[PDB]
Amino acid sequence: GTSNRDWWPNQLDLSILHRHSSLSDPMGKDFNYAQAFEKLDLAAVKRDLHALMTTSQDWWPADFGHYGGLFIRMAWHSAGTYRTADGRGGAGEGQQRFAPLNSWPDNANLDKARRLLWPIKQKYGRAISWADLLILTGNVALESMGFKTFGFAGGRADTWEPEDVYFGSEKIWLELSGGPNSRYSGDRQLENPLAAVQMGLIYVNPEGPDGNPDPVAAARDIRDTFARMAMNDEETVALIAGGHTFGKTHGAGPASNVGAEPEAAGIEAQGLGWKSAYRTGKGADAITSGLEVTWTTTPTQWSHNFFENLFGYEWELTKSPAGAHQWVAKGADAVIPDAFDPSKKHRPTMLTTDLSLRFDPAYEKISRRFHENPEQFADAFARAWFKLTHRDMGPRARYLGPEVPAEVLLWQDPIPAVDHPLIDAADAAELKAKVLASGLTVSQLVSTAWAAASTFRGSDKRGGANGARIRLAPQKDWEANQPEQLAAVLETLEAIRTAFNGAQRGGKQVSLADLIVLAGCAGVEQAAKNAGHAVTVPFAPGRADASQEQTDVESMAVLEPVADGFRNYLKGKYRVPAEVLLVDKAQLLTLSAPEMTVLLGGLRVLGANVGQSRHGVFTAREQALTNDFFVNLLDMGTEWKPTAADADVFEGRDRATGELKWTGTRVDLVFGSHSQLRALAEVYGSADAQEKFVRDFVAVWNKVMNLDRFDLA
Amino acid sequence: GTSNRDWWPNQLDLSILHRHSSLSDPMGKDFNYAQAFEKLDLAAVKRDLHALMTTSQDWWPADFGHYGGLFIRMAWHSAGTYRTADGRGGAGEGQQRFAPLNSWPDNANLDKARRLLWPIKQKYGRAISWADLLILTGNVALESMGFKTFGFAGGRADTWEPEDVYFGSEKIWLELSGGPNSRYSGDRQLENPLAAVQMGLIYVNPEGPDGNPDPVAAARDIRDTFARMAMNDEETVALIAGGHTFGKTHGAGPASNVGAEPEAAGIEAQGLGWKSAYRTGKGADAITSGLEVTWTTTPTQWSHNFFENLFGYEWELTKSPAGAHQWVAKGADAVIPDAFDPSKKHRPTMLTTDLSLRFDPAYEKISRRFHENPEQFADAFARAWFKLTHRDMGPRARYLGPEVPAEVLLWQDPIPAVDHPLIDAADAAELKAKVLASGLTVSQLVSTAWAAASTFRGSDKRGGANGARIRLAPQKDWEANQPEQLAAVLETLEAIRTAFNGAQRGGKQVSLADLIVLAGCAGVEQAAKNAGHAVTVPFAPGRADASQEQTDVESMAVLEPVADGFRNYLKGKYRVPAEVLLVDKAQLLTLSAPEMTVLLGGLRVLGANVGQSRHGVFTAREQALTNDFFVNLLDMGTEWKPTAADADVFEGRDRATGELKWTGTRVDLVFGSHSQLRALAEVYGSADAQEKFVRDFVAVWNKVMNLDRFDLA
Ligand code: HEM
Ligand code: HEM
Ligand SMILES: NNC(=O)c1ccncc1
Ligand SMILES: NNC(=O)c1ccncc1
Ligand SMILES: [Cl-]
Ligand SMILES: [Cl-]
Ligand code: NA
Ligand code: NA
């Protein structure tokens, strides 16, 4: 059956904005996962999970009698899809149970691990999500095997369909670099936003870069990919050595014995895959990665044996029974237990990427420290594991249940608690009047609040106006934020703030974070008034101001907008067309297509463009909130053509006279081109739509202003 | 960007069940189109449209100074995608303005026609849909040129995204038959559910079958395709001759002058396409089909000159300036006006498919009658035009506005007016008790009501339990309806009805259509009781009983279920997997994936399977409403394998012992295989879900029972 995607493969795809509708969700519209989880007996779940660890099922027998290693890998993979570039991936949506992740080569036999968990899921039902359960199971596996974890938070609501996530353009699983859809260019530069070296891997190739078993070169790919997943050198060494303290790999026979991945398997396989024709196809005979490495002398107990082995032997390159490159310890005795046969033992073995931890000079120093100081290793691993598994959960207000760590961590972008009375409706009116009397313009107020609030992305729930981090490094210096204009607005607002706070009694004060947002609302109210509409914009106080020292400048760098179609901004020239980047941004902001449409048309006429560009400013009454953008965009009296100078900029000329009327960008004109977008523009460009436009614009403005307000949830 | 669709191109696609979410709709949740339309000044819209007919725009100059012909083609194409096999296509959702239809070859330059309508759309806004406006514009064109139409109904609400519609498997536009994805097999048998001869055509090729200019052969394709669009010979001749009384075709130069269709054009084209490099690219120079035919001496006035020409000349095969086969009148005077030059005239011309109306024997007799009696021609065309343009609108209760024809037409599947008091809640409870006391079983009651209600399809809003047509030919003898069991149930219900109606005073009575639905509700309530749960199933009275004489038996044939996964029924062996046919049925029933999942699991345990098959009956308490289907489906203690006898039937055996527990079909086991469906099954198979299951089942049951109840809208 030929589809629109087949006919017009490069056309813009809006269906990513209409994922996660109430249609696909089996839970009622009023279902609140947090409330369900708060009533969960978490301690009872943990007991059940502890019992599961050593209750082997014959259809996938437990290595060494203990599933712990398998479940730690499961949880690590759930979390390890995360990318700092867009915040997409991670454990926070339980997407491991959907395509494509349920069927990635690197997730082979984690279908078994998830199926082991079904009885527990079934028992507790809606009170624990799959997303929470995968991580909790990893925690309990660690605990069972003698490692005390740093904490756990619930609150990852299940999702009910696959995410639309760009994982790369290769058409072959595991394709090596330099092919027709290569994710590498230049001096092994990995394309943004990707964080894995090959399609279907979590981070790197365990044999080495493109399969070449050079631990030094592997270490470069590790560093790069783990950095792109928010981990530094210390964290990376702690995690890899920590993980590989447990369990084993599986490569008992050739990989050609392994059949279809879950999404390709027969209906009778009931959601499982990689069925193996090698011997019993499981347990002693299992084939997962194709490697056959067991790292420690006690694979089901926390130990200090990973680094004893790493440093205590010299390593010889060898092959697994499936033909994969791996390393074996020169001259060693057979001291590593077999997973199934008590009369067999093995020599110590390592992956190429384990050897990275010794033969990369920077990792070597960390590895030695952790070798000599195992309590530092233990602490670093506990902290990194918590971080890995909670990275995408958002503000601490979202963390549920009785094991949430009290320690506030820098990577959480923390926001101070509010310790004083908030401003009320009268105070808000008074502050808005002051803001409008200062001389700040509609354009300045709307631009500044948009800049502050629109850093939020729902993928990892980072960013937003809470914290007033727009006044700090690096946000205050971002080109899109118009640093010089921004400094002047913040100075005026700081003065208004100081004078209001000065005049209060009791504890009462207003944060700059709130006043930024409030002042934007005032700008919108004023724009509406300029257009003859009497409008109040909703405002919710309670934001607090974070310090510079509470704001990791390096980690904040990934939130910088290099494309923001809502401000007609593009920082450079990219391969992806700007209207694809607009829809991507709308998705991160949680906007539907109608919300995207209304927001953009409003912001254009309010003066939110970077540099006060005229592109898409299709009105003769700028800073008045009207539907002019739509009425003028859709006017057939104007003809559009790309410019000689720049084929990404378009001139709109009167059809009859040739006179230039407007200019616009791809982002502006797509609303008059794309057949679904133009249908939405038509609604808002109709003669009956002025009040609808205004009211819908106010609603989406407010929604953006509140995106990070999990304190009000 | 590689997607799930690319990795697993044969997996089941559920997103068709989640179109038309509130997310993609720009209108508020309370928007009621009917209410907006009922306040439209229709007469003022018509005056505006009348003026538009003769107000030429220089970007697409009007042929002969009148756009009427263009708009009649536009409306005919809006309606002419319709297929009786599934009720998909037609004008009723305004889908011409979205992909792929906005860009089909046969819809070339109707982008111009829709753009001409923007000013009027913009003026009246939400009070007239695009879907209504396309048809109304066709009507006003006809009216303006002297043709009295039969009527017009409003009520087609706009839609906001493209439908998912199978239009064929060819990967090349207009591909001639016999390709690798040929829609023809055997002796030119067109595959169901298609109703056109080539990909991107409305019905047939105007040059002749696969381009071969033989009017006799062409007539075979005309008859076939028009029959698949619900039109008999008389209707077909009336429509084609009627339409081709007006306007002209466009083929002024070679077709290689024509550029990209709208979905492939540059952003600057602002939603238009087929930009032509031939001379001015428009007006006298236009290229649309590549044919250059003008049928009558008065293309802007209703006449009987199509038939005067068709019969009054002999016809010679010739070529247009674009190279297309067409016909010219031998030895004729130049009597046909030119569209732009008043000093030029032309000989009469015809399409191959116009000559079909003379050289097919059966068409010839109709065409002669219409030639000799143009008043019969006018009436037949008006009736056929109404039918064409309203075929997919559903029950007459949906028809809005002041021009709805009073005459009731057989093709409308009419339902008699109710002229008496309805039963109340006490009466309903009394009837449910009587039904349960008769000895009719849960299985019988549920199966009968399902059979009655589940003929509804939202594609053309035909079918449903209103009418009690299940008691008439042909429904009463459809194999899926279990004719012998059905007859016994209907007899018992008719006796209950007669006794209830006999005992009433004051005109109150219950229709059999209502009692069938009510009896099913009693079944579901009793099943719940059997499971230990007291529930009330909602029930709305007001259905009426249609007669055999009010039921077109041939037209009812397309509503026969040949696949109904909800009753585990497949009438034969098909190329399309049964789970794909399930999802197709769910879509026609307007179900989401969760609704589909709940409905199916309940029906299996209530005994709704045709022939009392045990397939998928995963319970030991049949005729109790429980979630046993899900709990048992998802039990990892059961292993599934296809049978030796039949690869589409599966045995579930205990994993440990090999004991046979269950059997199932692909439709049953897909819920344990497909990763999105299994996630939904999990929810309903959890230990906290019995009350949720019952409540959601009751809700979707009620929704199905009410699908055709536009009398309650
Ligand atoms: C350079 C990064 C890494 C590479 C290349 C890597 C590679 C692998 C491979 C190939 C396997 C064998 C899969 C199989 O055949 O069953 C494995 C197993 C495992 N990895 Fe890693 N890993 C990495 C990082 C991590 C991290 C960060 C953790 C956890 C903190 C972790 C924990 C595990 C565990 C527990 C197992 C054993 C699974 C079992 O016992 O069944 N790994 N790893
Ligand atoms: C066998 C069925 C039919 C065939 C093959 C057919 C074919 C065509 C073609 C090839 C054109 C020229 C397109 C262009 O170059 O602009 C055309 C024009 C037209 N057709 Fe048909 N047609 C059919 C049925 C109908 C029906 C059922 C109607 C209306 C009741 C209709 C009304 C028209 C009108 C009004 C035009 C003139 C468009 C203009 O003036 O711009 N046709 N037809
Ligand atoms: N790919 N997933 C996202 O981009 C996303 C998910 C949830 N809220 C916002 C964005
Ligand atoms: N293609 N679209 C349909 O089949 C349909 C549309 C609306 N309700 C039910 C079915
Ligand atoms: Cl994601
Ligand atoms: Cl459709
Ligand atoms: Na994420
Ligand atoms: Na339809």
Q: Structurally, how many domains does chain A consist of?
A: 4
Same domain, A174 and A261: yes
Name the residue among A458, A487, A496, A447 with its Cα closest to residue A613.
Answer: A447
How far is residue B378's CA from residue B648's CA, in Å, rounded to a whole number? 54
Annotated active-site positions of B, please? 77
Check if the beta carbon of residue A408 is closer than 8 Å to that of residue A414.
yes
**Residue B503 DSSP one-character state:** T
How far is residue A665's CA from residue A513's CA, in Å, rounded to a whole number? 32
Alpha-carbon torsion A197, A200, A204, A206, what sign?
negative
Question: What residues have a C-beta under 5 A from ligand 5, the ion?
Answer: A 88, 163, 165
Interface check for A548 against chain B (CB to CB < 8 A): the answer is no
How far is residue A78's CA from residue A672's CA, in Å, rounded to a whole number? 41
Same domain, A401 and A429: no
Asked if B673 lies within 8 A of A593 by C-beta distance, the reply is no
Three-class DSSP labels, A436-459: HHCCCCHHHHHHHHHHHHCCCECC
Check if the beta carbon of residue A688 is closer than 8 Å to that of residue A675.
no
How far is residue A412's CA from residue B519's CA, in Å, rounded to a whole number? 59
Check if the beta carbon of residue A128 is closer than 8 Å to that of residue A154.
yes
Name the residue among A424, A446, A415, A417 with its Cα closest to residue A500.
Answer: A424
Query: Which residues is B189 bridged to in the sheet?
Result: B185
Instruction: Provide the token pair at A580.
Output: 């694809």
At B653 the three-state DSSP class reads strand
Check if the beta carbon of residue A159 is closer than 8 Å to that of residue A100.
no
The technique by which this structure was obtained is X-ray
Separation in Å, CA B117 to CA A191, B33, B53, B133 = 46, 19, 10, 8
Interface check for B358 against chain A (CB to CB < 8 A): the answer is no
**Residue A345 DSSP one-character state:** E
Amino acid at site B495: A
Ligand 6 mean position, distance from CA B415 (Å): 25
Estimate the crossing angle of helix B512-530 against helix B483-502, to 10 degrees: 110
Q: Transcribe A113-124 into DSSP letters.
A: HHHHTHHHHHHH
Burial of B391 from C-beta contacts in 10 A (0-12 / 13-18 / 19+): buried
Ligand 3 mean position, distance from CA A587 (Å): 6
Look-up: residue for tokens 């009692």? B515
Look-up: residue for tokens 């936003």? A193
In terms of C-beta distances under 8 Å and separation of at least 24 residues, what long-range contacts does B178-185 make, across chains too?
Answer: B178/B210
B86 CA: nearest ligand 4 atom: 4
Estimate the crossing angle of helix B483-502 against helix B442-453, to 10 degrees: 90
Q: Which of A675, A677, A698 would best serve as a mutation to test chain B binding (most B beta carbons within 10 A)? A: A675
Instruction: Provide the token pair at A570.
Output: 């593009």
Last residue of a domain, one of B407, B425, B459: B407
Question: What residues have a C-beta under 5 A from ligand 6, the ion?
Answer: B 88, 163, 165
Task: Describe the strand order of the beta sheet including A349-350 as a list of residue ranges.
Answer: A315-319, A325-329, A349-350
Instruction: Provide the token pair at A63.
Output: 């290595």
Instruction: Provide the token pair at A265.
Output: 């398997």
Check if the beta carbon of residue A278 is closer than 8 Å to that of residue A285.
yes
At A185 the three-state DSSP class reads strand
Instruction: Provide the token pair at B370.
Output: 């219409």
Interface check for B118 against chain A (CB to CB < 8 A): the answer is yes
How far is residue A9's CA from residue A4's CA, in Å, rounded to a whole number? 8
B423 backbone φψ class: left, alpha, beta (φ>0; ψ -120 to 50): beta
Same domain, A328 and A394: no
Check if the beta carbon of residue A244 is closer than 8 Å to that of residue A306.
yes
Same domain, B281 and B172: yes
Question: φ and ψ at B65, to 5 degrees?
Answer: 70, 15
Look-up: residue for tokens 């691990």? A113
Q: Which of A18, A35, A618, A654 would best serve as a mutation to test chain B binding (most B beta carbons within 10 A)? A: A18
How far is residue B363's CA from residue B358's CA, in Å, rounded to a whole number? 6
Three-class DSSP labels, B298-345: CCCCCCCHHHHHHHHCCEEEEECCCCCEEEEECCCCCCEECCCCCCCE
How far is residue B236's CA from residue A356's CA, in Å, rounded to a whole number? 77
How many CB atoms sit inside 10 A of residue B412's CB? Answer: 19
- Angle, alpha carbons A218-A222-A226 (nearest 5°): 175
Alpha carbon dihedral B447, B453, B457, B462, in 10-degree steps, equals 140
Q: Which of B18, B169, B651 would best serve as a mutation to test chain A binding (most A beta carbons within 10 A)? A: B18
Three-class DSSP labels, B370-419: HHHCHHHHHHHHHHHHHHHHHCCCCCHHHCECCCCCCCCCHHHCCCCCCC
At A37 the three-state DSSP class reads helix
- Cβ-nearest to A666 among B97, B267, B684: B267
How far is residue B46's CA from residue B140's CA, in Å, rounded to a whole number? 6
User: What is the domain extent for residue B579?
Assistant: 565-688
Same domain, A588 and A658: yes
Look-up: residue for tokens 């899926």? B480
Check if the beta carbon of residue A155 is closer than 8 Å to that of residue A393.
yes
Instruction: Provide the token pair at B258.
Output: 């024509």
Query: To which H or E segment does residue A376 belong?
Result: helix A374-390
**Which residues 645-664 of B have a C-beta within 8 angstroms of A?**
650, 655-656
**Residue A365 DSSP one-character state:** H
Distance from chain centroid for Cα A637: 44
Same domain, B364 and B425: no
Residues of A in contact with B124 (CB under 8 A): 686-688
Which residue CA neighbors atom 6 of ligand 4 most closely?
A: B459
Residues of A in contact with B675 (CB under 8 A): 97-99, 102, 262-263, 271
Chain B nearest C-alpha distance from A641 (Å): 6
Same domain, B346 and B377: no
Strand ranges (DSSP E) for A584-656? 638-642, 649-654
How far is residue A348's CA from residue A308's CA, in Å, rounded to a whole number? 11
With a 6 A CB cut-off, is B101 part of the ligand 4 pocket? no
Residues of A in contact with B58 (CB under 8 A): 655-656
With a 6 A CB cut-off, is B159 part of the ligand 4 pocket? no
How far is residue A306's CA from residue A179's CA, in Å, rounded to a whole number? 36
Instruction: Provide the token pair at A611.
Output: 């540099």
Check if the beta carbon of residue A132 is closer than 8 Å to that of residue A156.
yes
**Helices vs. strands in chain A: H and E counts, helices first:** 24, 12
Interface check for B640 against chain A (CB to CB < 8 A): the answer is yes
Alpha-carbon torsion A272, A276, A281, A284, what sign?
negative
Check if the beta carbon of residue A613 is closer than 8 Å to that of residue A605.
no
Check if the beta carbon of residue A557 is closer than 8 Å to that of residue A483.
no
**Residue A43 DSSP one-character state:** H
**Which residues 21-50 of A have a C-beta within 8 angstroms of B?**
21-27
Please give the resolution of this entry in Å, rounded to 1 decimal: 1.9
Query: Which residues is B349 bridged to in the sheet?
Result: B328
Amino acid at site A704: V
Estimate the crossing angle of helix A675-684 against helix A593-606, to 10 degrees: 60
Instruction: Provide the token pair at A270.
Output: 């009931």
How far is residue A268's CA from residue B673's CA, in Å, rounded to a whole number? 7
Separation in Å, CA B292 to CA B69, B254, B324 = 14, 11, 8
**Which residues 95-114 of A have a C-beta within 8 angstroms of B?**
97-100, 102-103
A323 backbone φψ class: left, alpha, beta (φ>0; ψ -120 to 50): left
Same domain, A418 and A482: yes
Query: Which residues is A462 bridged to in the sheet?
Result: A457
Asked if A593 lies within 8 A of B24 by C-beta distance, the reply is yes
Ligand 1 mean position, distance from CA A144 (Å): 18
Check if the beta carbon of residue B589 is closer than 8 Å to that of residue B458.
yes
Continuous H helices in A145-275: 215-227, 233-243
Same domain, B573 and B559: no
Ligand 4 mean position, distance from CA B456 (Å): 11
Last residue of a domain, one of A316, A349, A372: A372
How far is residue B489's CA from residue B502's CA, in Å, rounded to a whole number? 20
How far is residue B115's CA from residue A629's CA, in Å, rounded to a whole number? 18
Check if the beta carbon of residue B526 is closer than 8 Å to that of residue B493.
no
How many CA atoms lie within 13 Å of A655's alpha carbon, on the beta-carbon side? 9
Amino acid at site B104: W
Asked if B676 lies within 8 A of A593 by C-beta distance, the reply is no
Asked if A1 lies within 8 A of B121 by C-beta distance, the reply is no
Q: Is B244 annotated as a binding residue?
A: yes
Which residue CA neighbors atom 3 of ligand 4 most closely?
A: B459
How far is residue A645's CA from residue A643's CA, in Å, rounded to a whole number? 5
**What CATH number does the domain containing B551 carry?**
1.10.520.10
Query: To which H or E segment does residue A563 belong?
Result: strand A563-564
Instruction: Provide the token pair at B659.
Output: 């004991």
Last residue of a domain, one of A356, A372, A388: A372
Burial B25-49 (b: 16+ CB within 10 A, else e): bbbeeeeebeebbeebebeebbeeb
Annotated active-site positions of A, please? 77
Instruction: Provide the token pair at B153.
Output: 């109904």
Q: Transcribe A74-127 into DSSP letters.
A: HHHHHHTT--TTT---SSTT-GGGSTTGGG-GGGTTHHHHHHHTHHHHHHHGGG
Residues of B in contact with A126 (CB under 8 A): 683, 686, 688-689
Go through chain B and tell me how many residues it has: 713
Strand ranges (DSSP E) for B557-669? 563-564, 569-570, 638-642, 649-654, 660-665
Separation in Å, CA A669 to CA A649, A663, B590 = 9, 10, 35
Amino acid at site B658: G
**What CATH number does the domain containing B367 carry?**
1.10.420.10
Q: What spatial distance separates the first Cα and last Cα of chain A, rounded to whole Å?
A: 44
How far is residue A244's CA from residue A326's CA, in Å, rounded to a whole number? 14
- Chain A to chain B Cβ contacts (< 8 Å): 248
Instruction: Provide the token pair at B377.
Output: 């021609």
Burial of B425 from C-beta contacts in 10 A (0-12 / 13-18 / 19+): exposed
Check if the beta carbon of residue A385 is closer than 8 Å to that of residue A473.
no
Name residues whose C-beta falls within 8 Å of residue A627's C-beta, 6 or more positions apart in sequence: A601, A684, A685, A689, A690, A693
Question: φ and ψ at B184, to 5 degrees?
Answer: -115, 145
- Angle, alpha carbons A549-A554-A557 (nearest 5°): 115
Check if the beta carbon of residue B140 is closer than 8 Å to that of residue B50.
yes
Same domain, A230 and A281: yes
Strand ranges (DSSP E) for A320-474? 325-329, 336-337, 345-346, 349-350
- Angle, alpha carbons B328-B330-B331 (nearest 5°): 125
Check if the beta carbon of residue A417 is closer than 8 Å to that of residue A424.
no
Check if the beta carbon of residue B586 is closer than 8 Å to that of residue B17.
yes
How far is residue A199's CA from residue A176's CA, in Å, rounded to a whole number? 9
Asked if A168 lies within 8 A of B2 by C-beta distance, the reply is yes
Burial of B629 from C-beta contacts in 10 A (0-12 / 13-18 / 19+): buried
How far is residue B244's CA from residue B358's CA, in Å, rounded to a whole number? 14
Same domain, B322 and B395: no
How far is residue B197's CA from residue B221's CA, in Å, rounded to a whole number? 7
What's the Rg (C-alpha) of chain B? 28
How far is residue A556's CA from residue B648's CA, in Å, rounded to a whole number? 55
Amino acid at site A90: G
Instruction: Provide the token pair at A313.
Output: 């032997």
Question: φ and ψ at B640, to 5 degrees?
Answer: -120, 140
Which residue CA neighbors atom 8 of ligand 3 most closely?
A: A458
Continuous H helices in B402-470: 425-437, 442-453
Look-up: residue for tokens 């009296």? A637
Burial B331-370 (b: 16+ CB within 10 A, else e): ebeeebbbbeeeeeebbbbbbbbbbbbbbbeebbebbeeb
Instruction: Provide the token pair at A532.
Output: 């003859």
How far is residue B78's CA from residue B94's CA, in Å, rounded to a whole number? 7
Same domain, A58 and A197: no
Go through chain A and tell me how many residues it has: 713
How far is residue A212's CA from residue B597's CA, in Å, rounded to a whole number? 48
Question: What residues have a C-beta under 5 A from ligand 8, the ion?
Answer: B 88, 90, 392, 459-460
Beta strand pairing call for B563-564 and B569-570:
antiparallel
Query: Which residues is B664 bridged to in the sheet?
Result: B650
Name the residue among A171, A3, A266 with its Cα closest to residue B15.
Answer: A3
Check if the beta carbon of residue A404 is closer than 8 Å to that of residue A410.
no
Beta strand pairing call for A189-190 and A315-319:
unpaired
Query: Which residues is B255 bridged to in the sheet?
Result: none
Name the residue among A492, A495, A536, A490 with its Cα closest to residue A513.
Answer: A490
